[PDB]
Amino acid sequence: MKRTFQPSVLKRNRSHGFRARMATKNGRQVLARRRAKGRARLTVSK
Amino acid sequence: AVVKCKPTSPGRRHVVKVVNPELHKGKPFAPLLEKNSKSGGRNNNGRITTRHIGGGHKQAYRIVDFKRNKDGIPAVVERLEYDPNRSANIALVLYKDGERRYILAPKGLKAGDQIQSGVDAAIKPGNTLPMRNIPVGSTVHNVEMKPGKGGQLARSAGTYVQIVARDGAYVTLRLRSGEMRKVEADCRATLGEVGNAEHMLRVLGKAGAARWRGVRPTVRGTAMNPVDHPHGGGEGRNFGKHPVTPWGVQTKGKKTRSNKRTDKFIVRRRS
RNA sequence: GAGGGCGCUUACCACUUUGUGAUUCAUGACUGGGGUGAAGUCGUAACAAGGUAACCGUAGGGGAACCUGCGGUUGGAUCA
RNA sequence: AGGACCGAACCGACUAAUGUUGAAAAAUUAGCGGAUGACUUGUGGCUGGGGGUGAAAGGCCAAUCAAACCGGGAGAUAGCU
RNA sequence: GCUCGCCGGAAGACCAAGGGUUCCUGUCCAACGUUAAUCGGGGCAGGGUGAGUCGACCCCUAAGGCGAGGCCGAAAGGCGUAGUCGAUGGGAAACAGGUUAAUAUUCCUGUACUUGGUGUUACUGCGAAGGGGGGACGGAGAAGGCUAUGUUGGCCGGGCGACGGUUGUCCCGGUUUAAGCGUGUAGGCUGGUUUUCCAGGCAAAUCCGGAAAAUCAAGGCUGAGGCGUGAUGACGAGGCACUACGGUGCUGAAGCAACAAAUGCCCUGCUUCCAGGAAAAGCCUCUAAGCAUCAGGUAACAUCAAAUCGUACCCCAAACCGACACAGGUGGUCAGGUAGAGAAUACCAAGGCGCUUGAGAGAACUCGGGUGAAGGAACUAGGCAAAAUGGUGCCGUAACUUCGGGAGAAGGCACGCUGAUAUGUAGGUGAGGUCCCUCGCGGAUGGAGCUGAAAUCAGUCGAAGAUACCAGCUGGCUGCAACUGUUUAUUAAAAACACAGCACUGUGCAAACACGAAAGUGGACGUAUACGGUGUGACGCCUGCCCGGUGCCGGAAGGUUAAU
RNA sequence: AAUUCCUUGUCGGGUAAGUUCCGACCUGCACGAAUGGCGUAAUGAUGGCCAGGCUGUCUCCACCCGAGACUCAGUGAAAU
C-alpha cells in the first residue's frame, strides 16, 4: 500500500539537506560530531 | 431590495438575499488591487492566533482613500459597485484632472454626482468639511479621529454617527453603540449615511455557504476534555461550573477594555 | 356431395379472484364538556352605587363565579 | 438553478468474506454510502514532543504514541521479582 | 515456428518528480533468482543516446525563508528595511522525411523562427531597476464557425471464389503530410478624425487620464478552418538491377466528397452566476539621464555564437517504493470498431501478455460457483446471512404537510425479429435554379446528395424477447437527531460532532485577543449591519418558582486591610 | 419512557403464548417548561413492533462444477 517514504530531491534536499544544516545552530553540530566520528561523508543527500 | 430565494434542494424557500440592481456588475479599477493572501488565523511563527477563520474563496483587496489625500479638488462619482472586502459598497471617484480613487459610499445610488471638499463647497451630503463649520444634531457619515489621520467609525452598511454638542476647538460624537466622546473640530466629516443599509436582512442559506466566506468549524469546548479546551468536563451535559474562554476565563459579561490613552475624551460608554 | 346442424374458433360475456384509494352504520380502554337531586363543600359573579359601577370587544391570569390591562359604550346611580 | 434524481472513475469504510510466523505490520474482494461539493487531490511552504494538528476521537504525528524517535544526567532510584 | 488462451480507458504506448546505463550485442555457471536453469533486470567484455528553439539554468514571482543599517534576547539565536532567495505558476524561438545494433525537433536533408553581436543601405530620437498599457487569471451552460478520428461514396489496385451461394441482394487494402508565412474569412468585439483647454500618474511626459466645439459615420480591432504555401517535394499499391543474398535505394500511381461528435481549435469567445477568482520580468509606450565621433529605433539585406547541465532506459513497474522478483502504493499524456447513455459491461483491433514451482488423483471436508421437491422465519438476543425486486417509456399514486414536499409513494402496462405505411416518415445537414445584395468563403427560398429515429399496423418463432452483461425491499405504528456533511486510521459512523439559524456576552480601532516577558505577526488593513468568546440547534405552540451558593455589572459611602 | 425498585403494573387493540409493540390509566424511588416542555413537514447503509412480499436461515439439506485437500517429484520455516 502507501509507504511513508515518498521520493523527491527538492523536498529531501531542503529537509535533511546540507546547506541549511551548515547555516543553523544545531545543524552545524551534526557536522562537528560527524567529523569526530570520522565519516566519509557529512551529507546524507546524494 | 431585498428578495426571497427558491428551493433547488431541501431547503431554501424562506431564505433572503440582498440584491442591489443599481450597482455596476463590471470590473474593479485595477491600479488599486493587492493580493492580500490569507493567513488562516495563524501568525508569522504560529499556531492559531484567531480561531474559526480559515479558507477562501481567493479575493483581492481594493485600496480605499479613507485618508482623503489632497484638499478642495473638484470630482465626480463615476461608478457605484459592490466590494467583498467590506459591506457598505464602494464609490469610484474621479477628480477633474483624471485622478481615480476608491472612496466610502453615500446612501445615494445616482451616479455622475459632482463632489468636492470645502466650506464654500455646496452644502449637500458627500462634500467633506471640518466639523468646526457645522451645527448640532447633524449626521456626519464616516470621520477621522485626529486631523488628517483618515476615516474610521460607521463604515458598515447603513451605519452613521451624529454630532450632539460642539464647543471651542472640539466636537462631541454620539455613537449608535451607546458611546459618546470628543474629537477635534479640525477633523473632517462627509455628512449623511453610508451605503447598502440592507446587509442585516440576509440569512445566508446552508452550512456550506459560509465555507467560502472564510469560515471553518471548531468543536464545542463543552464537548471535549479539559486537557484540550478548559470548558470540557467529564461525561458532559451537566457542567456544574461557569462558562469560559479557551484560557479558562469568564465568557459572559466580563469587561476587557484597558486602553488608558483615549478615555479622557469619553463622556458616556456602551452598556 | 350440397344445404343445415352438432363440433371448433375470432369477438363481446354473466359468474368470479386480487391490489390500491375512498365511503358508511354501529361499536371501543378511556375522557372532556351538558343534564340532575339533596337546608352538601368553597366562594359570592349579575340584579340597588349589587358590596372594587356595569356592559361590548380582546390578550393574559385564578380553584371558580370571574379578575386585571387597553380600546369602545353610558342602554347607569350619587353634588351629578 | 442544485451541500437535487441516478451511476463508473475517485473517495468513504456501513455490512458480508478471505487472511492471522499475512501477498498486506488492516490488506484484498463483493454489496453499500457519497460522486461541482461543507467533494476529492498533486507539489511546495508553515506549525513539533509537556510541543504540534484536530466538523474531537484526550484521535493522530514517517511500521513505535494519554508523551514517538535519538543523545546525556545515569551501571538513576526500587524495604521489590 | 505453428497452433492455443487472456488484456485491450490496459495486462497498450508516451511522461514529470523517481532511479540513473539496468538500453543494444556477445558471453557467463561461480554467487543470486520462490522448482530446474541452457536465462537474466546478477556477472564479464564490447556498442550507444550530438540541440539557440524540447528539458533545466541564464531572467520573474506566490506562500515562505534569509537579511547590512535598525531592533529583541544571558548568549547561541530570533525579527525586519534596503536587498536576496523561492515552484506546485510567469519568462522571444520548430516542423519531420531520412541513416544504423541502441537515440535524434539535435546527425543528414529541407525550411521556419528568437535574443544579442558584426557588417551593408535609407530614413531617423532613442531611453531608465522611473510613469501608463500588457502580463492577468473563478464556476457553469447553450448556440454559431470548425477539426484529428470513425462511417460511407467517388478515385487507385485486386477477387467472383473451397465446403451451400458469391461478375453482383458485394468483399479486401490504399486514399498520408508540417511548424511558418499569406488572404485575412467565419466566429467575436467596437465609434473615429480635427482644432483645443486642463489643479492627475512621488520629477517630467506628444503615453494614459479629465472635458468642449466642429464633422462624419458603414470603417476599425481580434482571429479558427478553408484555400494558398512550405511541395513541380516528401511518403505511397507499384517500377528496376544485383551480390545466388543480410536487402538494395533510386524512382512512382490514386491521394477527392459527404455525415456524427469532442476529451481538440476559433476560446485568456459569448451568455449567465456570485464565492469577483497571483505577482513580476521579458514585452509595448511616455519621459529623465546619456550622446550625435555615436549609441539606439523603423524597413531591407548579409552575418557570428547561443554557454551551462539534460537527453539511454524502466515508468503505473522484477530499472520508482513495498526487508523479497510480494494479488498493494502510483501526479501527468492518448481515447479505434460492434453493442451501450457510458472511461459500466460484453466481444474484438493496433499493441502487449500467458500471472516463473509443477505433475497426477478425482476422498470427505473446505474456499468460491450452478440447479433444486413440499412448506416458510417455524431461524437468531437480531428475518443476521441469503433471496425476491430491478431495465426504461408511459399511465397511475395515500396518509401526513410548513402546501415547497411526501413521490421513484402504492400500483399497472408494454418489450424479439421481419415487412410496410415512407422500396427511409419525423429530426439534422445541404448543392443547382431563383430572389435580396451596409456585395459574398454572404443571406432568404426550396430540397439533388448525406445521416436517419421512433411509433403504429400486420406478420413470424418458442412455454420464454429486460431474451446475455446492465438493474430499487414496499407499506402501517412508534422512539431519536431537524436536514446534506464529520468521527475513535486498525472491534463504535451514532442518538455524539458540525450547521444556516437562535440566544448570552466581549469589543470605539494602537478594538477585544493570541504566541512571545519583547521582537513582530495574525485579528485587519476589517471598523458595531464589524470582529472576538460561549452556549443552544429546522419549525410551530408555549415557556411557573428561586439571589442561600458560584461568577459578572453597576452603586459608591463605610468596614477588614498592604507598601508607606 | 433513551427516566419507574418491589413489578413480567392494568385495561383496550394484539399473539397459539407475548417481561415485545401501540393506545389509554396516573397507579412516573427526586420527567417538568432556553441543556428548555411537547408535537412536527423534510432526512435516515437507524433501535422497539406489525403486515405484505422472498427465501438453502430452517424443516433437511440432494446432486452437479472448479480450486485447495489427498499422492508424487524438487525448494524448504517457526513456536517448542
UniProtKB/Swiss-Prot annotation, chain A:
Keyword annotations of the record: Ribonucleoprotein, Ribosomal protein
GO biological process, one term: cytoplasmic translation
Disulfide bonds: none
Pfam families according to UniProt: Ribosomal_L34
Keyword Cell division belongs to the record: no
Segments forming a coiled coil: none
InterPro entries: Ribosomal_bL34 (IPR000271), Ribosomal_bL34_CS (IPR020939)
Cellular component GO terms held in the UniProt record: cytoplasm; cytosolic large ribosomal subunit
Membrane-spanning ranges: none
Domain of life the protein comes from: Bacteria
Family: Belongs to the bacterial ribosomal protein bL34 family.
Subunit (UniProt): Part of the 50S ribosomal subunit.
Protein name: Large ribosomal subunit protein bL34
Gene behind the chain: rpmH
UniProtKB/Swiss-Prot annotation, chain B:
NCBIfam families for the chain: rplB_bact
Keyword Ribonucleoprotein: yes
Keywords, ordered alphabetically: Acetylation, Ribonucleoprotein, Ribosomal protein, RNA-binding, rRNA-binding
Family per similarity comment: Belongs to the universal ribosomal protein uL2 family.
Positions of post-translational N6-acetyllysine modification: K241
Gene: rplB
Protein name per Swiss-Prot or TrEMBL: Large ribosomal subunit protein uL2
Miscellaneous section: This protein can be partially replaced in vivo by its H.marismortui (HmaL2) or human (L8, from the 60S cytoplasmic ribosome) homolog.
Quaternary data: Part of the 50S ribosomal subunit. Forms a bridge to the 30S subunit in the 70S ribosome, contacting the 16S rRNA. Interacts weakly with S6 in one of the 3.5 A resolved structures. In pull-down experiments interacts with CedA.
Record annotation: effect of changing H229Q: Loss of peptidyltransferase activity in reconstituted ribosomes. No change in rRNA binding or assembly into ribosomes
Biological-process GO terms, alphabetical: cytoplasmic translation; negative regulation of DNA-templated DNA replication initiation; ribosomal large subunit assembly
UniProt feature, compositional bias: Low complexity: 38-47
UniProt-recorded Gene Ontology molecular function terms: RNA binding; rRNA binding; structural constituent of ribosome; transferase activity; zinc ion binding
Organism, scientific name: Escherichia coli (strain K12)
